[PDB]
Amino acid sequence: QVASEYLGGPGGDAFDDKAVAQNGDITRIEMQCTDVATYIKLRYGKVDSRQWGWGNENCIQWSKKGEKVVHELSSGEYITSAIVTYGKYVQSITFKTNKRTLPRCGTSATEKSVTVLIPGGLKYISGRWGCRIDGLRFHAKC
Amino acid sequence: EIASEYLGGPGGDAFDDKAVAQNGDITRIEMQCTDVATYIKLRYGKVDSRQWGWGNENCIQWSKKGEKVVHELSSGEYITSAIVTYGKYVQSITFKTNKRTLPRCGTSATEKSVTVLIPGGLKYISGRWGCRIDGLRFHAKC
Numbered sequence: 001q002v003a004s005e006y007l008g009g010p011g012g013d014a015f016d017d018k019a020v021a022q023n024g025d026i027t028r029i030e031m032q033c034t035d036v037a038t039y040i041k042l043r044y045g046k047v048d049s050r051q052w053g054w055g056n057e058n059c060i061q062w063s064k065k066g067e068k069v070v071h072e073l074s075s076g077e078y079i080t081s082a083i084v085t086y087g088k089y090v091q092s093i094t095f096k097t098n099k100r101t102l103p104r105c106g107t108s109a110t111e112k113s114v115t116v117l118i119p120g121g122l123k124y125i126s127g128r129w130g131c132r133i134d135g136l137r138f139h140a141k142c
Numbered sequence: 143e144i145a146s147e148y149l150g151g152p153g154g155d156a157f158d159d160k161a162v163a164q165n166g167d168i169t170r171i172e173m174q175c176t177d178v179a180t181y182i183k184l185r186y187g188k189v190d191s192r193q194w195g196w197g198n199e200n201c202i203q204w205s206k207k208g209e210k211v212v213h214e215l216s217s218g219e220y221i222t223s224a225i226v227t228y229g230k231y232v233q234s235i236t237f238k239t240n241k242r243t244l245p246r247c248g249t250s251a252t253e254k255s256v257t258v259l260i261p262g263g264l265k266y267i268s269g270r271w272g273c274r275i276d277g278l279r280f281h282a283k284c
């Protein structure tokens with residue numbers, strides 16, 4: 001499908017939820033959130049992706065950890081906007097759906113900012129990960 | 143049925159290319175470009191819309207005119223995203239296709255920017271126009 005630019009840095013390892021996303025529309029957003037977003041894990045239909053981020057509890061050597069944040073999406077709800085601040089890593093993520101605006105994951109929003117609009121709803125994400133979210137790319141439905 | 147938010151201001155007159163777009167897939171982008179974009183005019187198959195912007199030469203009282211740019215799309219090329227900078231008016235537009243990033247229409251600016259994904263490729267545009275492009279909305283094929 002159509003996809004955004006890659007937003008972030010060259011670290012970590014690549015991930016791509018294309019296949020897992022064939023299980024269904026995004027139904028849930030799970031993230032780990034402190035002054036930065038340290039992982040993301042979407043649910044596609046009934047099937048969670050892997051935890052993309054916070055690879056190891058010893059990641060606490062290099063960033064804060066944060067708290068788990070869960071956003072359950074209702075039937076027919078889809079992500080239509082992502083505001084990302086990023087540099088070497090993704091710093092913060094603000095999602096908005098066709099039904100509501102979700103709180104920012106990552107209280108600091110000082111890095112370069114980009115707003116990606118996804119008419120019809122986000123289908124899935126790809127990017128890079130390790131102890132944090134090194135970068136993200138947003139994929140539309142066609 | 144999939145369409146972006148409207149990006150721009152309340153001035154000008156509404157336009158909508160839904161009917162003329164029945165003439166075919168977009169084959170050409172014509173714009174007029176100075177420091178800002180002053181009109182847009184897509185070609186649907188063989189058929190142009192009316193010129194959306196630079197209503198008449200008196201508009202030189204309020205902004206520069208600019209020069210005509212034409213991007214010819216090859217068969218099978220479709221517009222997959224647009225980076226739009228806007229406020230009261232559309233300031234600049236950078237179109238991207240499945241094959242290439244195209245030149246921006248308009249130069250650098252301080253206004254708000256968004257990246258619009260256009261799932262399945264752009265079908266047609268709507269918006270508002272007068273002396274320039276008051277706003278744009280992207281209607282996708284998905």
Ligand SMILES: OC[C@H]1O[C@H](OC[C@H]2O[C@@H](O)[C@H](O)[C@@H](O)[C@@H]2O)[C@H](O)[C@@H](O)[C@@H]1O
Pocket residue numbers: 010011012013062089129130131132133134
């Ligand atoms: O996902 C971010 C980052 O995770 C891993 O690196 C963790 C830290 O390793 C230290 O050696 C380094 O000084 C820190 O900057 C790193 O955050 C992973 O190896 C790396 O590729 C990822 O970018």
Ligand SMILES: OC[C@H]1O[C@H](OC[C@H]2O[C@@H](O)[C@H](O)[C@@H](O)[C@@H]2O)[C@H](O)[C@@H](O)[C@@H]1O
Pocket residue numbers: 153154155204271272273274275276
């Ligand atoms: O599409 C831009 C604009 O075109 C027309 O207005 C031209 C200018 O008129 C002046 O009176 C005004 O002070 C300027 O801001 C305008 O650019 C049109 O009438 C208007 O609706 C459109 O917004």
